[model samples]
Target: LTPDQIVAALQERGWQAEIVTEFSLLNEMVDVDPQGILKCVDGRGSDNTQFCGPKMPGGIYAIAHNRGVTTLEGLKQITKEVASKGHVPSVHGDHSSDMLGCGFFKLWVTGRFDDMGYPRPQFDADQGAKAVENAGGVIEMHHGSHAEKVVYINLVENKTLEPDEDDQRFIVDGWAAGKFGLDVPKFLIAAAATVEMLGGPKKAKIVIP
Candidate 1:
Protein backbone atom coordinates (compact mmCIF):
# COMPACT_ATOMS: atom_id res chain seq x y z
CA LEU A 1 0.00 0.00 0.00
CA THR A 2 1.15 3.55 -0.64
CA PRO A 3 2.03 5.59 2.44
CA ASP A 4 -0.91 7.89 1.71
CA GLN A 5 -3.20 4.89 1.51
CA ILE A 6 -1.89 3.60 4.84
CA VAL A 7 -2.52 6.97 6.42
CA ALA A 8 -6.05 7.01 5.04
CA ALA A 9 -6.77 3.51 6.34
CA LEU A 10 -5.47 4.31 9.81
CA GLN A 11 -7.30 7.64 9.95
CA GLU A 12 -10.48 5.77 9.19
CA ARG A 13 -9.90 3.77 12.35
CA GLY A 14 -9.87 6.91 14.53
CA TRP A 15 -6.11 7.49 14.52
CA GLN A 16 -4.48 10.77 13.58
CA ALA A 17 -1.82 10.03 10.99
CA GLU A 18 1.17 11.39 9.00
CA ILE A 19 4.27 10.32 7.14
CA VAL A 20 7.80 10.81 8.44
CA THR A 21 11.16 11.10 6.69
CA GLU A 22 13.10 8.92 9.12
CA PHE A 23 12.94 7.15 12.51
CA SER A 24 15.53 5.93 14.97
CA LEU A 25 16.02 4.45 18.43
CA LEU A 26 19.21 4.27 20.57
CA ASN A 27 20.10 7.71 19.32
CA GLU A 28 20.85 7.73 15.59
CA MET A 29 22.90 4.54 15.58
CA VAL A 30 19.91 2.47 14.58
CA ASP A 31 17.78 4.21 11.99
CA VAL A 32 15.00 3.75 9.42
CA ASP A 33 15.42 5.74 6.28
CA PRO A 34 13.46 8.02 3.90
CA GLN A 35 10.60 5.85 2.72
CA GLY A 36 10.23 7.53 5.98
CA ILE A 37 7.58 6.20 8.39
CA LEU A 38 3.89 6.33 9.18
CA LYS A 39 3.08 7.83 12.57
CA CYS A 40 -0.28 7.77 14.33
CA VAL A 41 -1.73 9.51 17.33
CA ASP A 42 -4.19 7.26 19.12
CA GLY A 43 -5.24 6.26 22.63
CA ARG A 44 -3.31 3.05 22.17
CA GLY A 45 -0.16 5.18 22.21
CA SER A 46 2.04 6.18 19.25
CA ASP A 47 1.56 3.84 16.32
CA ASN A 48 4.18 3.67 13.54
CA THR A 49 5.56 1.81 10.58
CA GLN A 50 9.26 2.28 11.24
CA PHE A 51 12.51 0.27 11.18
CA CYS A 52 11.44 -0.70 7.72
CA GLY A 53 13.05 1.33 4.92
CA PRO A 54 12.17 4.27 2.67
CA LYS A 55 8.62 5.25 1.72
CA MET A 56 6.84 4.24 -1.46
CA PRO A 57 8.33 1.02 -2.92
CA GLY A 58 10.44 0.31 0.12
CA GLY A 59 7.50 0.67 2.47
CA ILE A 60 5.45 -1.58 0.26
CA TYR A 61 8.18 -4.22 0.22
CA ALA A 62 8.64 -4.04 3.97
CA ILE A 63 4.94 -4.41 4.69
CA ALA A 64 4.57 -7.22 2.24
CA HIS A 65 7.52 -9.16 3.64
CA ASN A 66 6.96 -8.55 7.32
CA ARG A 67 3.21 -9.01 7.37
CA GLY A 68 3.11 -11.81 4.80
CA VAL A 69 0.82 -9.92 2.51
CA THR A 70 1.27 -9.20 -1.22
CA THR A 71 -1.56 -6.95 -2.31
CA LEU A 72 -3.42 -3.81 -1.26
CA GLU A 73 -6.35 -5.95 -0.14
CA GLY A 74 -4.04 -7.98 2.09
CA LEU A 75 -2.63 -4.84 3.65
CA LYS A 76 -6.14 -3.52 4.23
CA GLN A 77 -7.13 -6.82 5.83
CA ILE A 78 -4.18 -6.70 8.20
CA THR A 79 -4.93 -3.09 9.06
CA LYS A 80 -8.55 -3.97 9.68
CA GLU A 81 -7.55 -6.81 11.98
CA VAL A 82 -5.24 -4.51 13.88
CA ALA A 83 -7.84 -1.78 14.28
CA SER A 84 -10.88 -3.96 14.95
CA LYS A 85 -9.60 -7.18 16.49
CA GLY A 86 -6.19 -6.22 17.94
CA HIS A 87 -4.69 -9.22 16.23
CA VAL A 88 -1.15 -8.98 14.81
CA PRO A 89 -0.45 -12.23 13.08
CA SER A 90 2.97 -13.87 13.26
CA VAL A 91 5.29 -12.81 10.47
CA HIS A 92 7.24 -15.97 9.71
CA GLY A 93 6.81 -18.88 12.10
CA ASP A 94 4.92 -19.68 15.30
CA HIS A 95 5.23 -17.19 18.17
CA SER A 96 7.86 -19.26 19.98
CA SER A 97 10.78 -17.23 18.65
CA ASP A 98 11.74 -13.80 20.00
CA MET A 99 12.00 -11.91 16.73
CA LEU A 100 8.66 -13.25 15.62
CA GLY A 101 7.06 -12.53 18.98
CA CYS A 102 8.66 -9.12 19.23
CA GLY A 103 7.49 -8.31 15.73
CA PHE A 104 4.04 -9.51 16.66
CA PHE A 105 3.93 -7.66 19.97
CA LYS A 106 5.19 -4.39 18.52
CA LEU A 107 2.71 -4.45 15.67
CA TRP A 108 -0.08 -5.74 17.86
CA VAL A 109 0.30 -3.04 20.47
CA THR A 110 2.11 -0.11 18.86
CA GLY A 111 2.26 -1.05 15.19
CA ARG A 112 6.05 -1.05 14.63
CA PHE A 113 9.13 -3.24 14.09
CA ASP A 114 12.27 -3.94 11.95
CA ASP A 115 10.35 -6.72 10.07
CA MET A 116 13.35 -8.44 8.48
CA GLY A 117 13.20 -11.83 10.21
CA TYR A 118 15.88 -13.75 12.12
CA PRO A 119 19.02 -12.63 13.90
CA ARG A 120 16.83 -9.61 14.51
CA PRO A 121 19.14 -6.60 14.37
CA GLN A 122 20.12 -5.18 17.72
CA PHE A 123 19.52 -1.57 18.58
CA ASP A 124 22.10 0.10 20.89
CA ALA A 125 22.31 -2.06 24.04
CA ASP A 126 23.02 0.86 26.36
CA GLN A 127 19.98 2.68 25.07
CA GLY A 128 17.84 -0.43 25.50
CA ALA A 129 19.21 -0.96 29.02
CA LYS A 130 18.33 2.62 29.89
CA ALA A 131 14.85 2.09 28.57
CA VAL A 132 14.47 -1.01 30.74
CA GLU A 133 15.64 0.88 33.79
CA ASN A 134 13.19 3.64 33.10
CA ALA A 135 10.38 1.11 32.84
CA GLY A 136 11.30 -0.62 36.13
CA GLY A 137 12.50 -3.68 34.32
CA VAL A 138 15.70 -5.80 34.45
CA ILE A 139 18.29 -6.27 31.75
CA GLU A 140 19.95 -9.62 31.07
CA MET A 141 22.93 -9.53 28.77
CA HIS A 142 24.34 -12.45 26.86
CA HIS A 143 27.98 -12.89 27.91
CA GLY A 144 28.20 -9.22 28.80
CA SER A 145 27.51 -8.01 25.28
CA HIS A 146 24.82 -5.46 24.45
CA ALA A 147 24.68 -6.96 20.96
CA GLU A 148 22.73 -9.82 22.55
CA LYS A 149 20.41 -8.93 25.41
CA VAL A 150 17.02 -9.34 27.07
CA VAL A 151 14.89 -6.92 29.07
CA TYR A 152 12.51 -8.50 31.55
CA ILE A 153 9.46 -6.55 32.70
CA ASN A 154 7.11 -6.81 35.67
CA LEU A 155 9.28 -9.33 37.52
CA VAL A 156 9.07 -9.77 41.26
CA GLU A 157 11.57 -7.75 43.26
CA ASN A 158 14.69 -9.72 44.24
CA LYS A 159 13.29 -12.85 42.69
CA THR A 160 15.61 -15.77 42.03
CA LEU A 161 16.45 -16.12 38.35
CA GLU A 162 15.81 -19.52 36.86
CA PRO A 163 17.32 -21.01 33.75
CA ASP A 164 15.07 -21.77 30.83
CA GLU A 165 15.42 -22.57 27.16
CA ASP A 166 16.89 -19.65 25.20
CA ASP A 167 13.57 -19.06 23.54
CA GLN A 168 11.85 -18.73 26.94
CA ARG A 169 14.33 -16.26 28.43
CA PHE A 170 12.40 -13.13 27.51
CA ILE A 171 8.76 -12.21 27.21
CA VAL A 172 7.26 -8.85 26.18
CA ASP A 173 3.53 -8.62 26.79
CA GLY A 174 3.16 -12.40 26.40
CA TRP A 175 5.27 -12.28 23.25
CA ALA A 176 8.71 -13.90 23.28
CA ALA A 177 11.47 -11.28 23.23
CA GLY A 178 13.84 -13.70 21.59
CA LYS A 179 17.24 -12.02 21.65
CA PHE A 180 16.16 -8.38 21.61
CA GLY A 181 13.29 -7.95 23.99
CA LEU A 182 11.68 -4.66 24.89
CA ASP A 183 8.70 -4.47 27.24
CA VAL A 184 5.31 -3.43 25.87
CA PRO A 185 5.27 -0.29 27.98
CA LYS A 186 8.77 0.63 26.93
CA PHE A 187 7.91 -0.01 23.30
CA LEU A 188 4.96 2.36 23.59
CA ILE A 189 7.24 5.01 24.99
CA ALA A 190 9.80 4.40 22.30
CA ALA A 191 7.17 4.55 19.58
CA ALA A 192 5.91 7.81 21.02
CA ALA A 193 9.43 9.12 20.95
CA THR A 194 9.64 8.26 17.28
CA VAL A 195 6.59 10.41 16.56
CA GLU A 196 8.11 13.27 18.50
CA MET A 197 11.30 12.80 16.57
CA LEU A 198 9.31 13.13 13.38
CA GLY A 199 7.89 16.52 14.45
CA GLY A 200 4.48 15.11 15.47
CA PRO A 201 1.41 14.01 13.54
CA LYS A 202 -0.44 15.72 10.69
CA LYS A 203 -4.18 15.78 10.11
CA ALA A 204 -5.69 13.20 7.75
CA LYS A 205 -9.18 12.15 6.65
CA ILE A 206 -10.85 9.59 8.88
CA VAL A 207 -12.13 6.59 6.94
CA ILE A 208 -14.83 4.27 8.26
CA PRO A 209 -13.47 1.12 9.83
Candidate 2:
Protein backbone atom coordinates (compact mmCIF):
# COMPACT_ATOMS: atom_id res chain seq x y z
CA LEU A 1 0.00 0.00 0.00
CA THR A 2 2.79 2.39 -0.79
CA PRO A 3 2.04 5.58 -2.73
CA ASP A 4 3.10 3.81 -5.89
CA GLN A 5 0.74 0.98 -5.11
CA ILE A 6 -2.06 3.45 -4.43
CA VAL A 7 -1.56 5.09 -7.81
CA ALA A 8 -1.40 1.69 -9.49
CA ALA A 9 -4.76 0.67 -8.01
CA LEU A 10 -6.43 3.83 -9.25
CA GLN A 11 -4.96 3.36 -12.71
CA GLU A 12 -6.19 -0.21 -12.71
CA ARG A 13 -9.69 1.09 -12.02
CA GLY A 14 -9.42 3.62 -14.88
CA TRP A 15 -9.68 6.52 -12.46
CA GLN A 16 -7.75 9.62 -13.47
CA ALA A 17 -6.30 10.65 -10.14
CA GLU A 18 -4.07 13.59 -9.28
CA ILE A 19 -1.86 14.12 -6.29
CA VAL A 20 -2.59 17.83 -5.71
CA THR A 21 0.85 19.38 -5.31
CA GLU A 22 0.62 22.97 -6.56
CA PHE A 23 -2.17 25.28 -5.52
CA SER A 24 -2.85 27.18 -8.71
CA LEU A 25 -6.38 28.14 -7.64
CA LEU A 26 -5.71 28.69 -3.93
CA ASN A 27 -2.71 30.90 -4.66
CA GLU A 28 -5.01 33.36 -6.37
CA MET A 29 -7.70 33.41 -3.66
CA VAL A 30 -5.36 33.84 -0.69
CA ASP A 31 -4.99 37.55 -1.36
CA VAL A 32 -8.73 38.22 -1.11
CA ASP A 33 -9.26 35.92 1.94
CA PRO A 34 -12.95 36.06 1.25
CA GLN A 35 -14.60 34.81 4.43
CA GLY A 36 -17.83 36.15 2.98
CA ILE A 37 -17.60 33.75 0.07
CA LEU A 38 -17.44 30.92 2.58
CA LYS A 39 -20.52 32.28 4.30
CA CYS A 40 -22.55 32.00 1.09
CA VAL A 41 -21.96 28.26 1.07
CA ASP A 42 -23.64 26.23 3.79
CA GLY A 43 -21.13 24.36 5.93
CA ARG A 44 -22.52 20.79 5.69
CA GLY A 45 -26.06 21.97 5.31
CA SER A 46 -28.60 19.32 4.43
CA ASP A 47 -30.40 21.62 2.02
CA ASN A 48 -28.14 22.26 -0.92
CA THR A 49 -30.65 24.49 -2.66
CA GLN A 50 -27.55 26.59 -3.14
CA PHE A 51 -26.10 24.09 -5.67
CA CYS A 52 -27.19 21.39 -8.05
CA GLY A 53 -27.32 17.63 -7.32
CA PRO A 54 -27.19 15.64 -4.07
CA LYS A 55 -24.63 16.03 -1.31
CA MET A 56 -21.34 14.15 -1.66
CA PRO A 57 -19.70 11.70 0.71
CA GLY A 58 -16.61 12.88 2.50
CA GLY A 59 -13.45 11.51 0.84
CA ILE A 60 -10.68 9.85 2.84
CA TYR A 61 -7.19 11.32 2.43
CA ALA A 62 -3.85 10.42 4.04
CA ILE A 63 -1.38 12.58 5.92
CA ALA A 64 2.35 12.28 5.86
CA HIS A 65 4.00 11.47 9.18
CA ASN A 66 6.96 13.72 8.46
CA ARG A 67 7.59 16.66 6.18
CA GLY A 68 11.08 15.89 4.90
CA VAL A 69 10.61 12.27 3.82
CA THR A 70 8.46 11.26 0.83
CA THR A 71 8.90 7.48 0.72
CA LEU A 72 6.28 4.88 1.63
CA GLU A 73 6.98 3.86 5.27
CA GLY A 74 3.95 4.61 7.47
CA LEU A 75 1.59 5.15 4.55
CA LYS A 76 2.10 1.65 3.27
CA GLN A 77 0.99 0.26 6.58
CA ILE A 78 -2.11 2.43 6.47
CA THR A 79 -2.95 1.34 2.95
CA LYS A 80 -2.36 -2.28 3.81
CA GLU A 81 -4.81 -1.94 6.67
CA VAL A 82 -7.28 -0.17 4.40
CA ALA A 83 -6.96 -2.92 1.86
CA SER A 84 -7.52 -5.47 4.60
CA LYS A 85 -10.76 -3.64 5.23
CA GLY A 86 -11.60 -4.05 1.54
CA HIS A 87 -10.97 -0.49 0.38
CA VAL A 88 -9.12 1.12 -2.52
CA PRO A 89 -6.32 3.54 -1.78
CA SER A 90 -5.21 6.48 -3.94
CA VAL A 91 -2.16 8.67 -3.50
CA HIS A 92 -2.70 12.38 -3.07
CA GLY A 93 -0.22 15.00 -4.28
CA ASP A 94 2.84 16.39 -2.53
CA HIS A 95 0.90 19.22 -0.89
CA SER A 96 -1.44 16.70 0.69
CA SER A 97 -0.97 17.97 4.26
CA ASP A 98 1.83 15.57 4.98
CA MET A 99 4.56 16.55 7.41
CA LEU A 100 7.53 18.30 5.84
CA GLY A 101 8.95 14.93 4.84
CA CYS A 102 5.88 12.75 4.82
CA GLY A 103 3.14 11.99 2.21
CA PHE A 104 -0.34 10.53 2.41
CA PHE A 105 -2.34 8.03 0.32
CA LYS A 106 -6.08 8.44 0.03
CA LEU A 107 -8.71 5.70 -0.29
CA TRP A 108 -11.90 6.68 -2.10
CA VAL A 109 -15.10 4.71 -1.85
CA THR A 110 -18.83 5.31 -2.03
CA GLY A 111 -21.60 4.84 0.61
CA ARG A 112 -21.93 5.99 4.19
CA PHE A 113 -20.19 4.45 7.21
CA ASP A 114 -23.39 2.70 8.13
CA ASP A 115 -23.70 1.30 4.63
CA MET A 116 -20.07 0.26 4.81
CA GLY A 117 -20.97 -1.82 7.88
CA TYR A 118 -19.00 0.12 10.45
CA PRO A 119 -21.39 2.45 12.23
CA ARG A 120 -20.13 3.77 15.55
CA PRO A 121 -17.10 1.52 15.37
CA GLN A 122 -14.05 2.10 17.50
CA PHE A 123 -11.17 4.16 16.07
CA ASP A 124 -7.76 3.31 17.42
CA ALA A 125 -5.86 6.57 17.00
CA ASP A 126 -3.34 5.55 19.62
CA GLN A 127 -3.17 2.12 18.07
CA GLY A 128 -2.51 3.66 14.69
CA ALA A 129 0.16 5.88 16.22
CA LYS A 130 1.67 2.93 18.01
CA ALA A 131 1.82 0.99 14.78
CA VAL A 132 3.82 3.80 13.22
CA GLU A 133 5.95 4.13 16.33
CA ASN A 134 6.66 0.44 16.33
CA ALA A 135 7.78 0.79 12.74
CA GLY A 136 10.33 3.46 13.78
CA GLY A 137 8.11 6.17 12.36
CA VAL A 138 7.24 9.45 14.00
CA ILE A 139 3.73 9.74 15.39
CA GLU A 140 3.00 13.38 15.90
CA MET A 141 -0.20 15.38 15.97
CA HIS A 142 -0.26 19.13 15.56
CA HIS A 143 -2.31 21.10 18.04
CA GLY A 144 -4.89 23.52 16.61
CA SER A 145 -4.35 22.16 13.11
CA HIS A 146 -6.73 20.90 10.43
CA ALA A 147 -5.45 17.38 11.09
CA GLU A 148 -6.99 17.38 14.53
CA LYS A 149 -10.29 18.51 13.06
CA VAL A 150 -10.07 15.78 10.42
CA VAL A 151 -9.78 13.15 13.12
CA TYR A 152 -12.87 14.64 14.65
CA ILE A 153 -14.65 14.31 11.32
CA ASN A 154 -13.74 10.62 11.29
CA LEU A 155 -15.65 10.24 14.53
CA VAL A 156 -18.50 12.70 14.18
CA GLU A 157 -20.72 13.23 11.17
CA ASN A 158 -23.26 15.95 10.31
CA LYS A 159 -21.10 18.58 11.92
CA THR A 160 -19.58 20.61 9.11
CA LEU A 161 -20.61 22.69 6.11
CA GLU A 162 -19.62 21.09 2.79
CA PRO A 163 -18.45 23.30 -0.09
CA ASP A 164 -17.98 23.10 -3.83
CA GLU A 165 -14.66 23.17 -5.71
CA ASP A 166 -14.35 26.95 -5.64
CA ASP A 167 -14.94 26.89 -1.91
CA GLN A 168 -12.76 23.82 -1.27
CA ARG A 169 -9.85 25.36 -3.13
CA PHE A 170 -10.44 28.49 -1.05
CA ILE A 171 -10.24 26.39 2.12
CA VAL A 172 -7.03 24.58 1.07
CA ASP A 173 -5.59 27.95 0.18
CA GLY A 174 -6.77 29.37 3.48
CA TRP A 175 -4.94 26.63 5.33
CA ALA A 176 -1.75 27.12 3.31
CA ALA A 177 -1.78 30.93 3.48
CA GLY A 178 -2.87 31.02 7.12
CA LYS A 179 -5.75 33.33 6.24
CA PHE A 180 -8.52 31.99 8.47
CA GLY A 181 -8.71 29.24 11.03
CA LEU A 182 -10.71 26.09 10.11
CA ASP A 183 -13.02 24.21 12.43
CA VAL A 184 -13.97 20.53 12.26
CA PRO A 185 -17.56 21.18 11.25
CA LYS A 186 -16.72 23.66 8.52
CA PHE A 187 -14.08 21.39 7.06
CA LEU A 188 -16.33 18.35 7.07
CA ILE A 189 -19.19 20.25 5.48
CA ALA A 190 -16.96 21.73 2.83
CA ALA A 191 -15.38 18.36 2.12
CA ALA A 192 -18.69 16.51 1.92
CA ALA A 193 -20.06 19.06 -0.50
CA THR A 194 -17.02 19.00 -2.73
CA VAL A 195 -16.76 15.20 -2.83
CA GLU A 196 -20.43 14.92 -3.70
CA MET A 197 -19.97 17.47 -6.45
CA LEU A 198 -17.17 15.29 -7.79
CA GLY A 199 -19.69 12.44 -8.11
CA GLY A 200 -18.95 10.74 -4.81
CA PRO A 201 -21.42 9.02 -2.54
CA LYS A 202 -24.82 10.68 -2.28
CA LYS A 203 -27.06 7.86 -1.06
CA ALA A 204 -26.73 4.33 0.20
CA LYS A 205 -27.69 1.42 -2.06
CA ILE A 206 -27.85 -1.67 0.08
CA VAL A 207 -29.64 -3.54 -2.65
CA ILE A 208 -29.87 -3.02 -6.37
CA PRO A 209 -32.74 -0.79 -7.47
Model 1: per-residue Cα lDDT over 1-209, one tens digit each: 24455456445644465543212112312222322231111112112333221111111122333434434345444333332322222121122334422222224323343342312213322333243334332222222111112212211111111222332222111121111122333332333333333233423321111
- TM-score for each candidate, following the candidate numbering: 0.20, 0.23
Lowest summed-lDDT stretch of 10 residues in model 1?
A: 171-180
Please list the C-alpha lDDT of all candidates, in the order they appear: 0.27, 0.26
> lDDT by residue for model 2 over 154-195, one digit each (tens)?
111111223443323112211211111224333333343443
Give model 2's clash tally: 22
User: What's the lDDT of the predicted structure labeled candidate 2?
Assistant: 0.26
What TM-score does model 2 achieve against the real structure? 0.23
